[PDB]
């Protein structure tokens, strides 16, 4: 299957330049008809196309974000790079890359996206506290972090059903906080082990907390 | 350039209902394309070339239109269809999406399972106390949760986060966090969470005595 993975800074100060990288597989960009495009989504807003590039090195850019965009490719490493100059808090968004063909001018395969926040605030790692049980519910409290986002999983992704991970909320401190819970058989407590797997790439922080009665 | 006006912007329908979403472009276009997006997920291609079904997409979906008017239609709506839908044109630069349409699934009323969590011992050492109230698997989305410390209603010291509709049972889940300083926390005895919801004949109260 064709895959795409965006990568870049999670945090970037205003006026600074954003440099995104799209690494893909399953197809080659040097193949005729093949294209890669970038698309972003601001918080609570629709999707906005930004730029694209083709096998013949033809490039296009969205006039709205001009002339702040620079797109280039390197077929050797199977990757495309997008640069955005003079970043603004309004540029805060999730950025996607996606494949395209001239047989069909639409994006058939997308990356998972990477999140970019424009702020003068500095990064801070989360604190992970247990929400102990006492059907039974339990979970982890991921408190005081910046910026978004953080992923939570359970038993390394083995436990997925009954699992609810709440949208982070912004506390008055300016820091985000969120909870992830899971409902499990009251009987599997004490015998079955439950570990919440917190990940905060923006601060390169990884925590695995054991939740228990 | 080419702009896209999408309607309705929001929508609620019962499983089985026929649902039609409309996109109207400012200028003539050759093909209209449609994207489904789940929360915190990347958009998936639903319909391409105006009426062609993308791979792995239930024949439940269908497309139609020409010129400046196109519609997407879900024959019999189902739980997994909760999503935000976008139209997309690639007939001219810049490429553009529609404002989007948010689809919610009407289901039968369901009352919340209410749980309460006292602050962890690990947190109480850092100097802060967060009490968490959880309402699990309910509908509709409306729900009032009031905090009571020793029978004193609280205000301005709690936050709520509600889940995105479930793609299987179509329910929501909510969390209410009361945050105090360790000091204020140990100053009180009973902590209670009072829930009011449509599926509840009378307000449910979960509580605990400090320690």
């Amino acid at each position: 299957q064709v895959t795409l993975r965006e990568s870049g800074p999670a945090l970037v100060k205003p006026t600074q330049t954003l440099t995104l990288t799209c690494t893909f597989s399953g197809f080659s960009l040097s193949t005729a008809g093949m294209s890669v495009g970038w698309i972003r989504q601001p918080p609570g807003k629709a999707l906005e196309w930004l730029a694209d590039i083709w096998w013949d090195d033809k490039k296009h850019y969205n006039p709205s974000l001009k002339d702040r965009l620079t797109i280039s490719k390197d077929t050797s490493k199977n990757q495309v790079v997008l640069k955005v100059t003079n970043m603004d808090p309004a540029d805060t968004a999730t950025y996607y890359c996606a494949r395209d063909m001239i047989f069909n001018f639409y994006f058939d395969v997308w990356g998972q996206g990477t999140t970019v926040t424009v702020s003068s605030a500095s990064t801070k790692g989360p604190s992970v506290f247990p929400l102990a049980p006492s059907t039974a519910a339990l979970g982890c409290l991921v408190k005081d972090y910046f910026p978004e986002p953080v992923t939570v999983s359970w038993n390394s992704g083995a436990l997925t059903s009954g699992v609810h991970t709440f949208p982070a909320v912004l506390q008055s401190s300016g820091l985000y906080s969120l909870s992830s819970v899971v409902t499990v058989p009251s009987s599997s407590l004490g015998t079955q082990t439950y570990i919440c797997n917190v990940n905060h790439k923006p601060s390169n922080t990884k925590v695995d907390k054991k939740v228990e009665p | 350039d080419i702009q896209m006006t999408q309607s309705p912007s929001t929508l609620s329908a019962s499983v089985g209902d026929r649902v039609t979403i409309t996109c109207s472009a400012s200028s003539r276009v050759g093909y209209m394309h449609w994207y489904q997006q789940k929360p915190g997920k990347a958009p998936k291609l639903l319909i391409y070339d105006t009426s062609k079904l993308a791979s792995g997409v239930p024949s439940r979906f269908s497309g139609s239109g020409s010129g400046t008017e196109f519609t997407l239609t879900i024959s019999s709506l189902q739980p997994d269809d909760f999503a935000t839908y976008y139209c997309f044109q690639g007939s001219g630069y810049p490429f553009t999406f529609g404002g989007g349409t948010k689809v919610e699934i009407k289901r039968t009323v369901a009352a919340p399972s209410v749980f309460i969590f006292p602050p962890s011992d690990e947190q109480l050492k850092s100097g802060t106390a967060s009490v968490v109230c959880l309402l699990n698997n309910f509908y509709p989305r409306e729900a009032k949760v009031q905090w009571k410390v020793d029978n004193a209603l609280q205000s301005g010291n709690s936050q709520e986060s509600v889940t995105e509709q479930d793609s299987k049972d179509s329910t929501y889940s909510l969390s209410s966090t009361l945050t105090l300083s360790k000091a204020d926390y140990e100053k009180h005895k009973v902590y209670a969470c009072e829930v009011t919801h449509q599926g509840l004949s009378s307000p449910v109260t979960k509580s605990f005595n400090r320690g």
Binding site: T31, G33, W54, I102, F105 | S91
Partner: peptide, 24 residues
């Protein structure tokens, strides 16, 4: 045809026309 495509792309036409000519 890599060359037939690179030709269609080089032409000054609407994306629909390129797409039309590349699929056909």
């Amino acid at each position: 045809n890599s060359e037939l495509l690179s030709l269609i792309n080089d032409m000054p036409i609407t994306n629909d026309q390129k797409k039309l000519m590349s699929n056909n």
